[PDB]
Design a protein around this ligand. Structure first.
Ligand SMILES: *[C@@H]1O[C@H](CO[C@@H]2O[C@@H](C)[C@@H](O)[C@@H](O)[C@@H]2O)[C@@H](O[C@@H]2O[C@H](CO)[C@@H](O[C@@H]3O[C@H](CO[C@H]4O[C@H](CO)[C@@H](O)[C@H](O)[C@@H]4O[C@@H]4O[C@H](CO)[C@@H](O)[C@H](O)[C@H]4NC(C)=O)[C@@H](O)[C@H](O[C@H]4O[C@H](CO)[C@@H](O)[C@H](O)[C@@H]4O[C@@H]4O[C@H](CO)[C@@H](O)[C@H](O)[C@H]4NC(C)=O)[C@@H]3O)[C@H](O)[C@H]2NC(C)=O)[C@H](O)[C@H]1NC(C)=O
Ligand SMILES: *[C@@H]1O[C@H](CO)[C@@H](O[C@@H]2O[C@H](CO)[C@@H](O[C@@H]3O[C@H](CO[C@H]4O[C@H](CO)[C@@H](O)[C@H](O)[C@@H]4O[C@@H]4O[C@H](CO)[C@@H](O)[C@H](O)[C@H]4NC(C)=O)[C@@H](O)[C@H](O[C@H]4O[C@H](CO)[C@@H](O)[C@H](O)[C@@H]4O[C@@H]4O[C@H](CO)[C@@H](O)[C@H](O)[C@H]4NC(C)=O)[C@@H]3O)[C@H](O)[C@H]2NC(C)=O)[C@H](O)[C@H]1NC(C)=O
Lengths: 206, 207
């Protein structure tokens, strides 16, 4: 087999109402030795909370077996280490993989909305841009709204490392030019550990 | 045994006839016991004989790394020819074949828009000049900034991102001193992509 260990989604660790989890994915499980055991540890202290998902027979005739561990928001954000220890009869010895939050001082994102270029105003749809810079760690979530309703026609770049060791990204919301021209107000919502209440919003309208 | 990585040309290299685009087939984890490596190269399945293969080089981990480089014609790559590298070695149960080409699809022309700093950014020492490039296909592209003929050092560009209509977009962010912006220096975002006339377009930005 092989073992991959995955962090929680950024949004999930920032809101207590959400449920962040670490996920341990075991691939290339054969039919001849299908028995997978998981042990989990949080800073070396064994914990007992994880659930194994119903496996998927993969299209290469191997099993994908997945364990999910719920994490405390504040444990993840304070940098605790999550160790998944995997065993299987085709493995020489148990594989461990460990994960934790990027290390270092969190830095507050600066959020800037930018209207469409004049040149773009010739098209049927236009691009509303939210630049989010100066943040650390790169874990962040960005969404758009209007009139408190999610606007879902948007795409956000991955975080990119900037020259000062912080990250930036851009999010692009596309809207019908007629919605823009009629003065509708659009909001770029940013969630990040270094924002007050883990959230901020910036408006954009004509 | 050995593992093979096959690398495409850089996007600028296939777009400018002055440049030399190359496909590079790298074999690592070649052992001492079976160190001979043989490459065979194909273009659309037809064998070609003009690659340049370098002697094996031992790595610090006591395996060999062996590289073969095939020059490609600009128009072959841009017409979607498939380049196959086949690597034979006596430790393998069968030769390893790897293939690379430009992503399949009709090319699409990048639309290039420049956007000035947000009003709110103007209380900072440095401001952000943004170039939005969208609607392009395939995703191979190059973006640069300059002012007064000279390249601007401090910019970063996002990877291409797949858009909801199947084309790509990206943004590139040039950081300048607020004073330079304020004095009306003209900056220009230049873009190179196969679906642009002369594989180039440029858009300017100033206050
Ligand atoms: C023994 O040593 C050798 C040599 O290492 C050297 O010496 C040792 C002792 C140490 O000192 C090392 O620090 C030192 O470097 C080891 O050889 C390495 O082997 C690994 C695999 O085990 C290779 O990993 C691959 O790397 C490529 C990227 O490689 C480029 O970038 C590297 C730096 O980032 C650079 O080091 C490489 O030279 C190479 O650089 C490029 O070179 C090309 C050609 O010259 C040039 O044109 C470019 O300009 C230049 N670029 C840069 C940035 O410099 C990476 O792409 C591979 O990942 C793919 O495959 C993975 C599976 O193996 C997979 O998980 C990844 O997702 C990815 O998969 C690809 O995904 C995309 C979709 O996005 C898809 O399109 C692809 O199809 C898919 N590919 C596949 C195959 O599925 C991968 O990580 C190292 O390159 C190689 N090092 C060298 C120098 O050749 C060896 O491991 C050691 N052995 C042991 C037993 O220890
Ligand atoms: C049989 O069929 C199977 C399915 O097709 C196939 O299983 C596949 O196996 C490969 C390994 O062989 C495995 O590859 C890893 O993928 C990691 C990313 O996985 C993400 O994203 C992919 C899509 O990109 C999804 O398919 C995955 O499901 C997974 O999704 C994430 O999962 C959880 C859901 O629980 C979510 O929370 C996430 O939201 C979700 N993300 C996304 C985007 O969807 C990738 O990290 C791995 O890369 C690392 O390891 C490689 C070595 O194997 C390195 O080459 C690579 O460089 C990465 O290295 C790490 O990088 C760090 C620095 O960047 C280093 O510090 C680390 O040390 C370094 N690790 C190293 C060197 O070991 C890796 O590619 C696929 O995930 C898996 N597919 C599925 C569906 O599970 C089988 O192989 C098939 N078998 C055979 C024999 O043919």
């Amino acid at each position: 087999p092989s073992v991959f260990l995955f962090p929680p989604k950024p949004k999930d660790t920032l809101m207590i109402s959400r449920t962040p989890e670490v996920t341990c994915v075991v691939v290339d499980v054969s039919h001849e030795d299908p028995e997978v055991k998981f042990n989990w540890y949080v800073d070396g202290v064994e914990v007992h909370n994880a659930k194994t998902k119903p496996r998927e027979e993969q299209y290469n005739s191997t099993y994908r077996v997945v364990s999910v561990l719920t994490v405390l928001h504040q444990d993840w954000l304070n940098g605790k280490e999550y160790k998944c220890k995997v065993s299987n009869k085709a493995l020489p010895a148990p594989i461990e993989k460990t994960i934790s939050k990027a290390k270092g001082q969190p830095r507050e994102p600066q959020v800037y909305t930018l209207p469409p270029s004049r040149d773009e105003l010739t098209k049927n749809q236009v691009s509303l841009t939210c630049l989010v810079k100066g943040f650390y760690p790169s874990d962040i979530a960005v969404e758009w709204e209007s009139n408190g309703q999610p606007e879902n026609n948007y795409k956000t770049t991955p975080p990119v490392l900037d020259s000062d060791g912080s990250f930036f990204l851009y999010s692009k919301l596309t809207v019908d030019k007629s919605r823009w021209q009629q003065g509708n107000v659009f909001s770029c919502s940013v969630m990040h550990e270094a924002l007050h209440n883990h959230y901020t919003q910036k408006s954009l309208s004509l």
